[PDB]
Design a protein around this ligand. Structure first.
Ligand SMILES: COc1ccc(CC(=O)O)c(NC(=O)c2ccc(Cc3c[nH]c4nc(N)[nH]c(=O)c34)cc2)c1
Ligand SMILES: COc1ccc(CC(=O)O)c(NC(=O)c2ccc(Cc3c[nH]c4nc(N)[nH]c(=O)c34)cc2)c1
Ligand SMILES: O=c1ccn([C@H]2C[C@H](O)[C@@H](COP(=O)(O)O)O2)c(=O)[nH]1
Ligand SMILES: O=c1ccn([C@H]2C[C@H](O)[C@@H](COP(=O)(O)O)O2)c(=O)[nH]1
Lengths: 285, 285
């Protein structure tokens, strides 16, 4: 299962093409990839290197609450968005009225209030826009055979107001034999840094929704647009490519939860996570 | 290349699971599939059975014009949408105010006026909403390395107003070595009927955009959500699965076109299309 992520890494280093990008760093890029990770009695948290599990759980709870306040996530110890919410970055993009830590209409806002008019990170939008997350849960409970259980974060209207446009832009759920599956379309994949994080994030979301809807976790299908390896990540990924993968850990939910909003960080427990040492990979800014 | 579509058919018949759907017909379904079709000096128009090429070209020009009037497409000889625009069908879904042939805010409206308020099929929306198709062309000309060249038709706000929600919901373009590639995310794929049509449609759109932007056609990446074979299509697809694929035809554009709106149906010419006989496959309504 983890061999699919490693096979994608090996393919990019061997068959990828050099390609410049929004940053000064270069990449080896491949367009159009797909991998399938089993969620059955296992959780795909990569073992060939340590994955920031605390950031995965806290950011998803941050998404579900509909928050767009990077400082609210930074207070829980996760600073993965602080760079895109810094005063000097909001000023550069012309957001001279947003307080520091206001990312704009991002994942949390699109999942819960699609179409609503965005004010600021402190506003309450309850009852405004389309609650895609709850409608997805409702359609699973009442019509599992529905082929439209889709949550989309790509809003061309709200794109200019975002610090960073969504990378995981669209996801779709699927039910058969009481198994809940999820496919994610990711337009841009940092194979060294973001991709292992995003895999754990959407596998966690499937476990949450399967717990609420009474289903068993099935598969996670990771579909990529621009799958790229930054040049400064080639050697860190060559080290990881020599490590033998270990069995995936397991995820246990500690209490019966009724609504998706009732989940707390203490409700989750990772078991048997024995990863290889952390491999440093700088973030391209 | 055509063996990838046939390999997907073989996999669904062998490994698919029974699954009911919106219609009374059943399906054999598989969640999460991907195929890559080369657009280099060839056009992926299936040869193991005849594909309605006249409908592919006319429907795409109908999409590009932003039209939502099924009667305007039916007048060109293509009646693929008349079922979803019939007076007796609009009334069934409660659309007791639209004149016959008004599909609502569908592909053509979303490509050209995303976010605009939908009135009726006869309105002129020039200058309203987001023109996703033209910005995709602009970004390709000025910044080919951009990882955000996305056209999305999934609008949760406009979903209840559509006769049929988009199946080809999101597509992304990609440029490298002066080759234009396109990946389509299709939430629901009728493997017998729609999928061969959709492949030719988005391969045609890539040829159109590559012609305008001065690039060469690269690859088409077809990504599927619910890839299903209807029960009444199992035996027709077994016949097709025994036919030896023939070389793909070629597509030649007859005149230099400047804008995407200037394309006419007579500007295109299919050469060397020698398909196997048509195989009848009823449409599930
Ligand atoms: C493994 O141990 C740790 C320990 C601590 C941290 C927190 C920290 O990073 O300080 C991390 N971090 C992450 O897990 C991380 C960082 C960035 C994302 C997404 C993301 C935003 N913006 C981007 N820009 C580029 N180029 N690439 C990207 O990937 C992203 C996703 C995950 C890892
Ligand atoms: C000899 O080949 C021919 C000749 C003539 C025709 C025109 C005609 O159909 O009269 C056709 N038709 C199509 O190529 C066709 C029909 C429907 C679509 C999409 C579509 C809408 N709604 C759906 N519902 C279900 N279940 N499945 C689907 O696939 C769709 C895509 C293509 C094929
Ligand atoms: O969840 C995320 C967020 C970001 N990125 C990476 C992909 C790119 O390397 C970079 C975003 O840059 P663009 O594609 O927007 O230019 O961040 C991810 O992989 N996953
Ligand atoms: O461009 C299109 C339009 C429709 N369909 C098929 C897929 C499904 O069989 C049906 C739509 O039904 P829902 O998935 O909305 O239930 O039409 C396609 O394959 N391609």
């Amino acid at each position: 299962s983890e061999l699919q992520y490693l096979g994608q890494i090996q393919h990019i280093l061997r068959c990828g093409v050099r390609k410049d990008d929004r940053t000064g760093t270069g990449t080896l890029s491949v367009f159009g990839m797909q991998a399938r990770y089993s969620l059955r009695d296992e959780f795909p948290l990569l073992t060939t290197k340590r994955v920031f599990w605390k950031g995965v759980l806290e950011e998803l709870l941050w998404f579900i609450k509909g928050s767009t306040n990077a400082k609210e996530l930074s207070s829980k110890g996760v600073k993965i968005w602080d760079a895109n919410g810094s005063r000097d970055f909001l000023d550069s993009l012309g957001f001279s009225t947003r307080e520091e830590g206001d990312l704009g209409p991002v994942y949390g806002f699109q999942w819960r209030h699609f179409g609503a008019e965005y004010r600021d990170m402190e506003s309450d939008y309850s009852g405004q826009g389309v609650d895609q997350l709850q409608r997805v849960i409702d359609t699973i409970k009442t019509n599992p055979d529905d082929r439209r259980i889709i949550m989309c974060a790509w809003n061309p209207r709200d794109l200019p107001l975002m610090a960073l446009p969504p990378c995981h832009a669209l996801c779709q759920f699927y039910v058969v034999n009481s198994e809940l599956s999820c496919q994610l379309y990711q337009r841009s994949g940092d194979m060294g840094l973001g991709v292992p994080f995003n895999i754990a994030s959407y596998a966690l979301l499937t476990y949450m929704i399967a717990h609420i809807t009474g289903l068993k976790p099935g598969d996670f299908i990771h579909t990529l647009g621009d799958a790229h390896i930054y040049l400064n990540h080639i050697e860190p990924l060559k080290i990881q490519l020599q490590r033998e993968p270990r069995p995936f850990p397991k995820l246990r939910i500690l209490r019966k939860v009724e609504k998706i909003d009732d989940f707390k960080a203490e409700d989750f427990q990772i078991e048997g996570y024995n990863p290889h040492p952390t491999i440093k990979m700088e973030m391209a800014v």
